[PDB]
Write an enzyme that holds these catalytic residues in place. Sequence first.
Site, PDB file in Angstrom:
ATOM      1  N   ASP A   1     -69.826   5.283 -43.231  1.00  0.00           N
ATOM      2  CA  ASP A   1     -68.503   5.065 -42.653  1.00  0.00           C
ATOM      3  C   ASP A   1     -67.618   6.295 -42.412  1.00  0.00           C
ATOM      4  O   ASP A   1     -67.435   6.716 -41.266  1.00  0.00           O
ATOM      5  CB  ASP A   1     -67.724   4.038 -43.494  1.00  0.00           C
TER       6      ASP A   1
ATOM      7  N   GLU B   1     -65.501  10.903 -54.505  1.00  0.00           N
ATOM      8  CA  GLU B   1     -64.390  10.115 -55.029  1.00  0.00           C
ATOM      9  C   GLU B   1     -63.261  10.995 -55.576  1.00  0.00           C
ATOM     10  O   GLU B   1     -62.085  10.670 -55.428  1.00  0.00           O
ATOM     11  CB  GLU B   1     -64.882   9.170 -56.133  1.00  0.00           C
TER      12      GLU B   1
ATOM     13  N   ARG C   1     -59.410  11.221 -53.691  1.00  0.00           N
ATOM     14  CA  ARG C   1     -58.319  10.685 -54.490  1.00  0.00           C
ATOM     15  C   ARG C   1     -57.508  11.756 -55.208  1.00  0.00           C
ATOM     16  O   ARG C   1     -56.291  11.844 -55.024  1.00  0.00           O
ATOM     17  CB  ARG C   1     -58.850   9.670 -55.523  1.00  0.00           C
TER      18      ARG C   1
ATOM     19  N   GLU D   1     -58.809  -1.144 -45.512  1.00  0.00           N
ATOM     20  CA  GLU D   1     -59.316  -1.006 -44.149  1.00  0.00           C
ATOM     21  C   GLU D   1     -58.645  -1.810 -43.042  1.00  0.00           C
ATOM     22  O   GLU D   1     -58.397  -1.270 -41.960  1.00  0.00           O
ATOM     23  CB  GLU D   1     -60.827  -1.248 -44.115  1.00  0.00           C
TER      24      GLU D   1
HETATM   25  O1  LIG Z   1     -61.817   0.213 -49.519  1.00  0.00           O
HETATM   26  C1  LIG Z   1     -61.676   1.576 -49.946  1.00  0.00           C
HETATM   27  C2  LIG Z   1     -62.289   2.617 -50.932  1.00  0.00           C
HETATM   28  N1  LIG Z   1     -63.666   3.134 -50.415  1.00  0.00           N
HETATM   29  C3  LIG Z   1     -63.748   3.827 -49.135  1.00  0.00           C
HETATM   30  C4  LIG Z   1     -62.942   5.177 -49.339  1.00  0.00           C
HETATM   31  O2  LIG Z   1     -62.950   5.963 -48.159  1.00  0.00           O
HETATM   32  C5  LIG Z   1     -61.441   4.844 -49.760  1.00  0.00           C
HETATM   33  O3  LIG Z   1     -60.776   4.267 -48.642  1.00  0.00           O
HETATM   34  C6  LIG Z   1     -61.429   3.935 -51.079  1.00  0.00           C
HETATM   35  O4  LIG Z   1     -62.127   4.721 -52.055  1.00  0.00           O
HETATM   36 CA   LIG Z   2     -61.231   5.139 -46.168  1.00  0.00          CA
END
Ligand SMILES: OC[C@H]1NC[C@@H](O)[C@@H](O)[C@@H]1O
Ligand SMILES: [Ca+2]
Length: 456
Positions: free
Chosen positions: A222, A91, A95, A358
């Site tokens: 994912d 995370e 970010r 997404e």
């Molecule tokens: O819906 C998004 C959330 N989780 C997946 C991560 O890759 C990022 O896109 C965000 O932290």
């Molecule tokens: Ca993502």
Amino acid sequence: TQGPVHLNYRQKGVIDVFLHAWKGYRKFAWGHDELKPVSRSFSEWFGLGLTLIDALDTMWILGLRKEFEEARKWVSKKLHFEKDVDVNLFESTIRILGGLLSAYHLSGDSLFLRKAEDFGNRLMPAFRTPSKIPYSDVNIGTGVAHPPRSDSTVAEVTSIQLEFRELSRLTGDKKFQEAVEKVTQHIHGLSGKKDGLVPMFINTHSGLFTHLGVFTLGARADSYYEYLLKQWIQGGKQETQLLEDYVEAIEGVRTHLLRHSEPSKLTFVGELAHGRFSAKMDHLVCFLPGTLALGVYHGLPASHMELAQELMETCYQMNRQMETGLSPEIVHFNLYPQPGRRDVEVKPADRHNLLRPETVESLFYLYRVTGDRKYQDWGWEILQSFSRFTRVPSGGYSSINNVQDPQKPEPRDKMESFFLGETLKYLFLLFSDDPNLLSLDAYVFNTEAHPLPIWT
Ligand SMILES: OC[C@H]1NC[C@@H](O)[C@@H](O)[C@@H]1O
Ligand SMILES: [Ca+2]
């Protein structure tokens, strides 16, 4: 209260939504991680101005320079990593590190690079494990890393590569790239995959996959597939192993998780657990059609395009079948012939919507690659739903509990940083009619919508 004249009406709309959102943040959560729009408060997760940092490149791209400058002032004087706090390696990387790297590249302000290198160094303790596969958490202040409240998730250790590689390129300090690449290379040979599909967990001590036999393209896996391709594109398309693993993974998806709903035949990706298929798809999975289209642009199989277009349509429908027009956290699909049955099913516990990106993320890729204006239209419709059901008068936007009830959506009183860092960024880029704006030829977005330059 006035925006540039050149902007087409959809981009201006995005900017109008951003300002309203930024408004709540400035008044109630300035310098804080996340805004609590409803209660006009805030919440701290790392205590590092998460939302401000995650939104830096978005403000710059939207031409909100006054806002950017003010946020830049905060980073210059209030952002301190000398704190005794535990953070999730993944995370933080996507970010904070990705956010700073992007900000540095768009603005040219060396400040952001300095902070990025600082942060990058404080994250390194996480790789100190027997297998070299990183621990889940790390205290940036004390320097000690550790597993979560056991194992590390596969996506998490394989979705931090773009950021670390770039930091090495910019600083000349190769330790970042090396640590991160060792992980990718180890995962490459690791057995336990099902035709490219990787398990959800990996042991940091033995460096082996755990929770074998359970595969999903949603949470915990994912971005692993996303970064296989993106790293490839990042390195100038020379790291063929990444490419190979990626195409294998896609074929594996076709063969084991790809199904069609009844009666409309909606193409969707489900989860597989020890042979038992489950027609369950996280909204998170909606990143796939985007990544799929991205690859096609870069020379991947035309079959990838059809899959992209098909999944884009499904993700679109995942949003549109809801009364508010916003997709729920998870969507189940009906699999067997039943007359009056709907294709999309949503369980009560999953009717939440946290303003995830997404869907709009993938629409952006589909439009850039196909030039089909309908994807812009679809994005416009989703922005409308956000405006109608998640807007908070005093400022900001909130996640909601009931995506199926337009009269009582139920705000959860929280605005995720990815809403300003991703959702509104992709929408702004989607509505652009300029292919040279963060061209797919020159930039590659990390998993948190932070653009990083493709190498030469
Ligand atoms: O819906 C998004 C959330 N989780 C997946 C991560 O890759 C990022 O896109 C965000 O932290
Ligand atoms: Ca993502």
